[PDB]
Amino acid sequence: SASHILIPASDLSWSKQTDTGITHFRAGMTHEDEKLIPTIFRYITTWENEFLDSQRVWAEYATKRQEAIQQNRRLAFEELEGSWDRGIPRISTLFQRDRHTLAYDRGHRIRREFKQYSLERNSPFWWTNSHHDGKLWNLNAYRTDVIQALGGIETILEHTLFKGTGFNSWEGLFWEKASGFEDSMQFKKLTHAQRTGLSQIPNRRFTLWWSPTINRANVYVGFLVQLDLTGIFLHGKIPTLKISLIQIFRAHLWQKIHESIVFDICQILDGELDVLQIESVTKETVHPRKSYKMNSSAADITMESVHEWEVSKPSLLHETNDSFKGLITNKMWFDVQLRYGDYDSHDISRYVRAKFLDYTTDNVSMYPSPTGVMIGIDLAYNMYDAYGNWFNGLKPLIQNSMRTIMKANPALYVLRERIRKGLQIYQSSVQEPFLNSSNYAELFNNDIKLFVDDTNVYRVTVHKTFEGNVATKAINGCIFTLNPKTGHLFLKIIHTSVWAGQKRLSQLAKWKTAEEVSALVRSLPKEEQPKQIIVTRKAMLDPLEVHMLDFPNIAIRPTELRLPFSAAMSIDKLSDVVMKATEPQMVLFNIYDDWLDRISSYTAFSRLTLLLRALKTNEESAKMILLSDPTITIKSYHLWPSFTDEQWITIESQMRDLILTEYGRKYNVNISALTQTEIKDIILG
Amino acid sequence: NESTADILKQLPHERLQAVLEKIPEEDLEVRRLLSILKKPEVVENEDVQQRRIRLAEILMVDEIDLENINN
Amino acid sequence: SYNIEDTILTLKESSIFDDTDSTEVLENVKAAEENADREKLRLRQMNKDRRQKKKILNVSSLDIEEEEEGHLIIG
Amino acid sequence: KALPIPEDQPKKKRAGRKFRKYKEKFRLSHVRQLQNRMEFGKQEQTVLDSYGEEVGLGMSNTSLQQAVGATSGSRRSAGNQAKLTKVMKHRISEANQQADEFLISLGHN
Amino acid sequence: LGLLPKPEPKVKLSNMMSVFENDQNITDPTAWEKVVKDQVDLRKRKHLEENE
Amino acid sequence: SLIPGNVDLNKLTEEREKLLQSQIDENLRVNSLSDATLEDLQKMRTILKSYRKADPTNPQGWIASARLEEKARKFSVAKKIIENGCQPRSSDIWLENIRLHESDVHYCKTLVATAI
Amino acid sequence: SVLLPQLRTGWHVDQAIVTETKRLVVIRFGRKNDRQCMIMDELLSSIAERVRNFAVIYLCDIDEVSDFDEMYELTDPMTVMFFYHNKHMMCDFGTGNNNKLNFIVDDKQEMIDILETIFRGARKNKGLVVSPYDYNHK
Amino acid sequence: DLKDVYASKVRLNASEREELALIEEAYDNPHDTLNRIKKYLLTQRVFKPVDITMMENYQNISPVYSVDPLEKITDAYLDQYLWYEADQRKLFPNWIK
RNA sequence: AUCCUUAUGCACGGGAAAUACGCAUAUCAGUGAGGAUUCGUCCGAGAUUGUGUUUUUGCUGGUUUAAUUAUAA
């Protein structure tokens, strides 16, 4: 902005909800130099000031050059780090990595003006390459000064729906550029009209995101209308927001919310008959259309007295001091009313006591006893209030009720999705698609790849005895990595001695591992360094990255498949090497033995997944199934007993059978009910 | 059991395929019948069978009457 | 140093910065996946029963909340 | 020629192996998505176009790689790497050899 | 029109991992290796055969 | 490949000249990417803090929070952070801190001296 | 013009509107001495064949047959109306009168996006088509 | 400098991806492409038509030319050269600016 | 009797492209389609015109509980 236009003081007021109570904010009571949207004019340096800095800066340059030269040294990067950003050729130029090839570029400035002719796009900066000169301005600071000068983020978001999606804090989230969605819809085949229709949506996400302040009295004036079945008003047609709001409320969602809440409350007091001595409580019948009818209202929940109840002056959920001596009466009700608010009125409380005092003292509103509590809710902001008559054991209950509820109802939570689609905000987890059973076949593609296990790295194992109890030891652990193609393992054993002098071994472990991976890749010539390194435990995303930074090519996935690579340690030869380890070391193996020469990597990996997936289950009772033929040799070379192919047909038939049997036993779904899919998922997860 | 077998025979490949069936199999007899129909006696590289086919195609395309009506 | 249980125990998965200063646990590898797959299974059979037999769940606030709800050794 | 008919059609979904490699072209990459995701509340990375105008690459670098300016190697799809049209291809190669024999005529002489 | 047998996917080693034909893709790893391998040699034979 | 940040020319040239001259003989931190945002810098500070409080000793940990941090900023932060964790057997900590904090023959040779 | 066929009777009208099965019906109501009723006649003259698949165009002077004037409320020189399976198609232009049409559209491509857009809407049975373009200020 | 029209673009149209192809090939097998250049210099005197479309300042219409991507290469090489030498030999004096 | 070669056909394995390919009673076209240059020559088979598809052809993949009926009166 270059212009003088300032912040109407009414727009700096905001709100927040504490469990203790609503807290409010206005910074506008205190009158100061009133608030101006900072404008470009201050963020730019007059050309003079620069050029002058060009003389001097270049001077101290050439001098200090002759200084390091006077040492036969070259200018340390250090000095000029005093000031980079100043001078017309600037500085970072001199430190550009590529300068040796730019000296061979000449006459750029004549070109860059001529680019006018060769091609179309306007080139509003034609007087510099940023390679030669560097960068001639920073509008960074501007960003901040606009935010702050608008009163800090929160005071903005109060202008949004963002409370509606009810993320607690925004700090984990990413947007979705619309341009992506739009383009991703352009590669299809679209009529020119269809094409224009992709102009809109990147608005339509906007006017939602701003709908509270766009939609309000002070703005469109005009006359209200309601959306069809719901409780929202439109000061003007706003043809976008209408449609998108509809798609936020369908299946008559408004109601289903209402009912869901009320229903949950009676499910509360229902349990509470005892505590308060309430002779009963009823969900009333409701004119089905009540939830959104505004002018008039009826009660909802009915409440009874073993003897009677001492009412109070009607008060607010967060208020403390009570007068029960005020009255004594019998039987109570509740209303649940929803309003979907604006930035104009986002504060419910006043909305409550307006509706309480009104409807209570109203003629047409029908509340069987003039005793009962108003519970309203802001859908828009997730706010809630109740201004009721009061008993012992209500507020201490009810507060705890609502709290739990806002975290709970399927309904509300089906706003907080269905909206946060419309806005397309997402929580950030990881974009990287995991291996799933669908994804699975890709493993055998031609990428060099690894699996990595932290499970057995730290092992203190327990056994039962005669006297004290629980024989328990720290054990040399295994860091179990493999490449399913060549079947080379890597075991980094971590010896107990390293563990001793540290605490809180959880994190430190994972870090030990992450290093073992980084260096372990560094034991590989890049020809043999892999691409997808497939993590098991999610938490290993972070620690690998930091140590895998220098290897940008190498993508890291976790999976959803629980992979039985720890049960390998059950193997004799393995636990031999590992249990005997006196020091942390690296030990290679081929788990495939040679199944390769016999049959392809795929199967070879499959049957392996069988042996393991069972060795988490039948374990030794499976180990007999391996050992049921003594005639058959296990070399020092190999691990698995060699066989014929047929013999494996038989084995894998058995092994296959087990995991089913024991599975459908533990989980008591008979084997016979399972789809081929389902079975193999069970083999995998 | 009609429209099926109809389209089935009405399909051009089959419809030819019967017309192949009846014609003799020799170099000499067929090749004769070729040159009688005026066509080139031999096409550059073809083993006998393909020559027979080559007739059948010529018969269908032109919609000639049968080889007896040829003669 | 905190335990959950010739049995071996391994460190349970925990995030570095989310864990920060917190009590660390020792679980059995087979028992973790065991319990998790029992619970998740109980959810699946209830899915097939609900969607197949077309029954509507009671649930709501306290039930879903309780669903959100879902020994030291010296060595 | 008459514009066909506005009416949409049920999608034929045939995804082979072959057919897939023919798709990878027209469908946004992975990286090309990790542009689009704009980290909330925090200014983008942007770079300067030819024209210096800023192309936001929003998430294309995991925030650990912003602090170090590590750019990305990540994954580079060879699937959509642009390739010549048929015709143009032979004009290229053809002209290349022709110029090369002309050259070798400057080679021996 | 039904007269002929509906076709079936040819399955090679490279292709074997992919095929979602119902048949023991994992469960029988080696018995599934079997039908594939003997499938290929079925064809290959039929080639040599026909030539002869 | 067109994600614009990744490009610098000089590496390009060395790689290409080798490709060309080799062919014929057989025939016989870039400026473009904008600076680190604040709270990301804050994040790396945090994760490095957790990885430091992993092991107080084992200097490679502090070394990371030295080098990685020092790559975006350094300034006084890095120097005080390297002087802290050095509280000495490994000549490596000294190889890095020498090369860093020295800046003058006097203090250069104080990191020389106490090291010796 | 010569491409555009014309109507001489309210009988022609309602038969046409009934007797075009599968595609939109477009009718200009306007008086030959009007200005726009020439212009718009041209614009539609250039789109006739190009749309002929999913719609069809007819010219009707109010002065010829003024019958419908009362029932469809015809003011202005030129009002185009769209009928598909005998139903009056209603596409809100933001102009403030959702029914029918009034003013002049100055782009072929536009006009096509309209005839199309409405069409596609009318094939689903939605009574409201929402124009691509809000020209309201007209 | 034939690359950086694109470095923003998400979606290459047809003619583009043709160029960007060439730019990458010649950018890959240089010795060949250089040879192709040198020949073009030493002989080629005929060229494919070149296409105008006009920019706008809304005030001065300016012309805009577009050339076959091939030819554009030998050009941009040559041009690059002439400016390199010409300033190596100090042809252009001060006041041309 | 063996081999190579050549072309064509049936195949088998493998890769590549699907801005490619068609189609046409079109129209022409070694009786020159088209092109080049060092201006002496050289090269020598399709081009035009219209038209259709072309994020595709066929197929196949996964998520938005039957009837019958029994008492002592």
Swiss-Prot record, chain B:
Cellular localisation: Nucleus
Ranges in a coiled coil: none
Organism domain of life: Eukaryota
TM ranges: none
Function: Involved in RNA splicing. Is required for the association of U4/U6 snRNP with U5 snRNP in an early step of spliceosome assembly.
Record's subunit section: Component of the U4/U6-U5 tri-snRNP complex composed of the U4, U6 and U5 snRNAs and at least PRP3, PRP4, PRP6, PRP8, PRP18, PRP31, PRP38, SNU13, SNU23, SNU66, SNU114, SPP381, SMB1, SMD1, SMD2, SMD3, SMX2, SMX3, LSM2, LSM3, LSM4, LSM5, LSM6, LSM7, LSM8, BRR2 and DIB1.
Note in the entry: Present with 1770 molecules/cell in log phase SD medium.
Name recorded for this polypeptide: U4/U6 small nuclear ribonucleoprotein PRP4
Organism whose genome encodes this protein: Saccharomyces cerevisiae (strain ATCC 204508 / S288c) (Baker's yeast)
UniProtKB/Swiss-Prot annotation, chain C:
Cellular localization per UniProt: Nucleus
Subunit structure: Component of the U4/U6-U5 tri-snRNP complex composed of the U4, U6 and U5 snRNAs and at least PRP3, PRP4, PRP6, PRP8, PRP18, PRP31, PRP38, SNU13, SNU23, SNU66, SNU114, SPP381, SMB1, SMD1, SMD2, SMD3, SMX2, SMX3, LSM2, LSM3, LSM4, LSM5, LSM6, LSM7, LSM8, BRR2 and DIB1. Interacts with the pre-mRNA-splicing helicase BRR2 and the ubiquitin-like modifier HUB1.
Function in brief: Component of the U4/U6.U5 tri-snRNP particle, one of the building blocks of the spliceosome. Required for pre-mRNA splicing.
Family, similarity comment: Belongs to the SNU66/SART1 family.
Descriptive protein name: 66 kDa U4/U6.U5 small nuclear ribonucleoprotein component
Organism: Saccharomyces cerevisiae (strain ATCC 204508 / S288c) (Baker's yeast)
First-to-last residue of the parent protein present: 148 to 236 of 587
Curated annotation (Swiss-Prot), chain D:
Family, similarity comment: Belongs to the PRP31 family.
Subcellular localization: Nucleus
Record text on subunit structure and interactions: Component of the U4/U6-U5 tri-snRNP complex composed of the U4, U6 and U5 snRNAs and at least PRP3, PRP4, PRP6, PRP8, PRP18, PRP31, PRP38, SNU13, SNU23, SNU66, SNU114, SPP381, SMB1, SMD1, SMD2, SMD3, SMX2, SMX3, LSM2, LSM3, LSM4, LSM5, LSM6, LSM7, LSM8, BRR2 and DIB1.
Function: Promotes the association of the U4/U6.U5 tri-snRNP particle with pre-spliceosomes to form the mature spliceosomal complex.
Miscellaneous information on this protein: Present with 1260 molecules/cell in log phase SD medium.
Domain notes: Interacts with the snRNP via the Nop domain.
Annotated protein name in UniProt: Pre-mRNA-processing factor 31
Superkingdom of the organism of origin: Eukaryota
Region (Disordered) location: 1-17
Organism from which the protein derives: Saccharomyces cerevisiae (strain ATCC 204508 / S288c)
Swiss-Prot record, chain G:
Major place of residence: nucleus
Subunit annotation: Component of the U4/U6-U5 tri-snRNP complex composed of the U4, U6 and U5 snRNAs and at least PRP3, PRP4, PRP6, PRP8, PRP18, PRP31, PRP38, SNU13, SNU23, SNU66, SNU114, SPP381, SMB1, SMD1, SMD2, SMD3, SMX2, SMX3, LSM2, LSM3, LSM4, LSM5, LSM6, LSM7, LSM8, BRR2 and DIB1.
SUPFAM superfamilies cross-referenced by the UniProt entry: Thioredoxin-like (SSF52833)
Protein name as catalogued: Spliceosomal protein DIB1
Family designation: Belongs to the DIM1 family.
Keyword Acetylation appears in the UniProt entry: yes
Keyword Acetylation tagged: yes
Alphabetically ordered keywords of this record: Acetylation, mRNA processing, mRNA splicing, Nucleus
Top-level lineage group: Eukaryota
GO biological process: mRNA splicing, via spliceosome
SMART domains, per database record: DIM1
Pfam families xrefs: DIM1
GO cellular component: nucleus; spliceosomal complex; U4/U6 x U5 tri-snRNP complex; U5 snRNP
Gene encoding the protein: DIB1
Entry's localization field: Nucleus
PANTHER family assigned to the protein according to its UniProt record, in alphabetical order: THIOREDOXIN-LIKE PROTEIN 4A, THIOREDOXIN-LIKE PROTEN 4A, 4B
Role description: Essential role in pre-mRNA splicing. Also essential for entry into mitosis (G2/M progression) as well as for chromosome segregation during mitosis.
